[PDB]
Design a protein around this ligand. Structure first.
Ligand SMILES: *C1=C(C(=O)OC)C(C)(C)N(O)C1(C)C
Ligand SMILES: *C1=C(C(=O)OC)C(C)(C)N(O)C1(C)C
Length: 162
């Protein structure tokens, strides 16, 4: 198991534009296209991301291509953020993947706002951090996925993904 296999489980794979759990146009392995309600706006975003006129459908190879860029962008966002980089640097590789997972789902700024959870992770107070992380809109709106990510933070193992 690794961050790619982890997010592939959490995000799925769909080759046509669909609406994500928030109602936002998405494609591939959780590639958010736009929060705009305009399907043409989402299709324009898709064409720009792929470099061709797609009419809202991509191939599996294209989906995996976007996914690799998106995982990279999540890591890049963490390492440039003054709030997230210290926590990331302090973590083992499995818990690092859990933080990347959260940034992939909610964005750099969103995760960087989890000030008290981040402190608890930095302190390596894993059970306490797990309790705090669940006190969130994130957990309430996607509880099964959040439970898996939180278990990964709590234990430092892949138990929730096997
Ligand atoms: C990845 C791609 C790919 O692997 O599909 C063959 C394309 C669509 C060529 N490219 O735009 C990226 C780099 C996104
Ligand atoms: C890092 C980036 C990156 O390396 O994506 C793979 C982008 C998204 C260009 N950038 O905004 C940071 C600095 C976060």
């Amino acid at each position: 198991m690794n961050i790619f296999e982890m997010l592939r489980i959490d995000e799925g794979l769909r080759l046509k534009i669909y609406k994500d759990t928030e109602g936002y146009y998405t494609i591939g392995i959780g590639h958010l296209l736009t929060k705009s309600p305009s399907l043409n706006a989402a299709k324009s975003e898709l064409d720009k991301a792929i470099g061709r006129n797609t009419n809202g459908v991509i191939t599996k190879d294209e989906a995996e291509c976007l996914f690799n860029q998106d995982v990279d962008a999540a890591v890049c966002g963490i390492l440039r953020n003054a709030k997230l980089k210290p926590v990331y640097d302090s973590l083992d590789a499995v818990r690092r993947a859990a933080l990347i997972n959260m940034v992939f789902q909610m964005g750099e700024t969103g995760v960087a706002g989890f000030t008290n959870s981040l402190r608890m992770l930095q302190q390596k107070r894993w059970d306490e951090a797990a309790v705090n992380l669940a006190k969130s809109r994130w957990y309430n709106q996607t509880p099964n996925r959040a439970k898996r990510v939180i278990t990964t933070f709590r234990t430092g193992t892949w138990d929730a993904y096997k």
